[PDB]
Amino acid sequence: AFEALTGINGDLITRSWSASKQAYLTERYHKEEAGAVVIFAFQPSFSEKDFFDPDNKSSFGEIKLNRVQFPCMRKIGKGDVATVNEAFLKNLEAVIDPRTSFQASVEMAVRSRKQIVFTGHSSGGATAILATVWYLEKYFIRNPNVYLEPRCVTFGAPLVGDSIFSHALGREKWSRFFVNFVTRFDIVPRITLARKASVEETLPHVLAQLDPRNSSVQESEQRITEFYTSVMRDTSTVANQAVCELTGSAEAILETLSSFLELSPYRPAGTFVFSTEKRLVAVNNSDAILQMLFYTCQASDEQEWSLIPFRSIRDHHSYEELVQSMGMKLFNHLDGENSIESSLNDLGVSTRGRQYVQAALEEEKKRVENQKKIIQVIQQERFLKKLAWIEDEYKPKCQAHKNGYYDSFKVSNEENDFKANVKRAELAGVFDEVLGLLKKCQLPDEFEGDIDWIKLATRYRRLVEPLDIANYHRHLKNEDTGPYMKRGRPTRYIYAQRGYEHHILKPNGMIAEDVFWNKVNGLNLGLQLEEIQETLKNSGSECGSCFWAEVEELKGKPYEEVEVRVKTLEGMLREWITAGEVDEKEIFLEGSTFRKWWITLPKNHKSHSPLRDYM
Template sequence: MFNRFLYKPPNPKLRVFVNLSRAERRASSELQKMVHSRLEDATGLKEELIGNAWSAAVKAHKHADKPFLLDKTRDFSIISFAGSWSPEAWFSASDSSFGETKIDRQLFPSVRSIGLDEYAEVNSAFFRRFEAILGKLKDVLKANKPVVFTGHSAGGPVAILATIWLLEQQRNSNTNFTPPKCITFGSPLVGNFIFSHALKREKWSIHFVHFVTRYDIVPRIHLAPLPSLQPHLQTILTSLNSRSLGSASNGNVATEFFMTVMRNASAVASNAACHLMGNTNLLLDTLKSFVKLSPYSPFGTYIFFTDSEKVVVVTNPDAVLQILFFACQLSSESECDNIAHQSLKAHWEYESKMRQNLELLHAIRLDELDKLPLSLTGRNTPITQALNELGLSSRALLNLRAAGSYEEQKIKNQERMSVKKQDIEKLLNRLEENYRDVCKVDGLGYYDAFKLQKDPKDFQANIKRLEQAGIWDEIVEMLKRYELPDEFEGQDEWIQIGTRFRCLYEPLDIANYYRHSKNDDTGPYMIKGRPKRYRFTQRWLEHNQKMTEPSEVSTLWAEVEELRIQTRTKLYAECSREILELEKKMKRWLNEIENDMLLKKSTFMEWWKTLPEHHRSQSCIRDDIERMANTEDATNSM
């Protein structure tokens, strides 16, 4: 029945990152490498801790009047959050149809795309619940014992946000802490793809483990907009709370609710699959402009329970999204009512799963998704058995393989950029040794020499500038499309080389900008002319170093140029505040600017000498200017 809700890609010849025939030939041998393991080996969590977390999550439901419960074991403090059965606790009607809002950048400064400086979106209702208990939560987190946050149902999102908040606190602390763990059961989705991207970049995703039974409707609810769910949402939540169908069985409420959720889940999963497969059909963009899809995305490690003593472990968020849809896809219309009712009952099946001996569960890790077979027929391995028990069709397997291949393509893109990193380093070394240092010997800084363009070496420096710009612009475009691994912007080697590139080459871009008077047509460099390659690399450093003030060393020349322009038509008194601010910045970054700005013939010094005597005599950089002048005189007399 639900096959009719599955969006068919308009172009049958999609670019898929897999070679189907070759993959089929080697599928049998590759599958043998994906052996099953114990749950502890797959998640890094002891089975006893998982059981304790479930017990705490259930206990929290019985004390819903309290913001959370605190239980202590020998090794951990377990903080559990109760669910809520009011629609207002799941969706905020005052926000968009999916109830999302921008995350609080003060509480969660890391949950963003660094280069784009775009913060994640989270469910507003869940976020408000977290904010309401944060004050009390701070009071119990002063002990040094490792913390586990847990929650079932709507308690899961609060546990997730509490975990991220504590990880943020630990990131900003100089003390070594054991990172908190988060274990959820049947949790709804919380944030969008930037949420997932940021947690993986910060290496925080590994601390989150989400348990999901095959048919549980709750992890899928937020794939549908509130207006489509509103007629039956309270009835469904009441049934979930009472652990019985109750009024949800009257008038096929459960069936209608299930169909609504899965119809939207189909659209989300199909759109995601088209993206993974590289579909460029413009019809998709046209459809998205009329029909808004759910922004929510999975993250962390997902543990899917099968009907037997197996669990399927998935860490790829794109693959998790596909499983959330395909595991509930119906094979015939006659199944609809039964599966709809089962989707409500499954929300409490974790209890029976936790009563089992968790040590006997076989954990099947789906690490090499691009090596999955395209059909499960006639195959009898632990993996194929588990995937069969999740009800995954051939189309589901194709989408899972595309998810794996898409991730592999990101890694290949990074490898390609790593090769170009050698070219970047060569160009940086040549510019430093053959241009910047030579210009300083000539008595004129490389900024002013480049701006004048009187020597062949200036022309060669411009060629190197353009070569570097091409490489870095390619990296920026891939980052904008999220075509590099999520961890890329947090890697020390790229942060270091990006900072070196910015500090060395941006002054040349500024010189070129004002040499050609682009400011007359476009406006100030910092507002209209600054390329993204410098904005991105600056944000990388500031985030990595937890800087409270911007790293402005590479843009000081732009401020000099703008002040030179202003003081031609304005009195000193009108510009004094900006001039003092510039000098303070220069003082702060003096060791980083290689003293080029303080050379006697520099653009800055020629302008600075025109400032009133009373200003120059009291300037915070006066001593540095005098020291540089003495050094320059001594060098010239040798």
């Protein structure tokens, strides 16, 4: 039952562990070729510099990822980029360096259709996790069918990413590829959950005792006990806050403490397998694993409490015993179990820790139920009829009047315009409600990646955003509130746009902004890039469904003042039409605001304009 869930057998685990140990003898990495499998093992390090970067001035050695090199490691709709440990990222950067032949070896294995496996022990396993993401970004994501599913297997690895990191891994359906083995008491997976000020004095000694090749520094009881107590105190604070950061009826005190609490951002990413003498327990839910990292590291009675720090040290070197006795241990998948009492009882988890784990699992199943309900909703006839009516009845009738459905909605002279407004409001309510669920993290990580949702939301945005723009300008909202692009655009459309752009752009490693600015510079405007960015600030040319918004912002202004934005809109129009973002049957109509304004442009522009032959 273990292999059908993790997709790896005991053979691969054993080879990965052997390579991770062999990596101790190299400078950067060791490559082990085992027929169809190529294993890259990274050398671990036990200096405090390699856990908290000296030049990092944050309380947990964290740093935001560069959106250019890891475009997927972010929230799509919200935009917030993921955060990782800076020391681990610098170490990965040092191993990806062309001079190391690491990348050449990766591509040699890729061309050979070998099963690629990334692995490492202790902090080396953390590097392996980041290397896997690099692989996922560079190779697997561009065409995930012919490329072979990789595996990342870590042993006692520190935590690497934050909650956004885990969310992004979940959305891409990548978490299933990661297995992190953690012996019950192992202190190392808990290390980065503590504030760096809490262990600044005791960390070098503990790292010296944990290093298997450093039998020089004499073991000190005091330092290890102080270290364990500091780590457990900060871990307990993080876990209890995570408990509160799920429930409710206390958002005020949580916001005040958020302004005054420094809690570690690092969260479990991927499947975790906890091991005892008699059990192997696999867990997928990151929140549940976070809780288990605390409640599995306590004493059963409190008189053994003086003994626990030494077992928490010794357990970091007990993964060898784990690997040899895998098949002799009882395995269960915690998320799929009908009863979790036995597993958590064997892990020494207290009653309260079990109730927190159960609550985290209940919350994830609630999110799954919400997604099933959303699919049932968006497939019902009463919902789809509104979009069908807008597309097949309102638009053709407005085209027949030779003014278009934007101008017809804007003047709203007929009953059909108020009926369209009613259905626009109902659709707005439904998509705002979905956005609300997303904002509260009450949908599955995969939600923003579901292609059925992206299809529907794109059809909705293309059909109805022109109508919300018309409604906006009908009520004179642009000077009072401000620019639509600046202060008026509903967030639901921004989420829809970003979800679609990510869906279509992520196989090519590029981000929407880069594609946009490359086309803008491709339009041969001649102006300085900084000047154009100044002109195109809050421009409507970043999304085809904001075409009419840009017209509103461009009409009335002198030609010299917004010439660049005009030429930008023209350069985007044909591709937008080809892509279906803008309907060609609408914008050229006799009574269209766009056509009426386009004729009033100077004749020198209209003469050499791409639209001369269309109006």
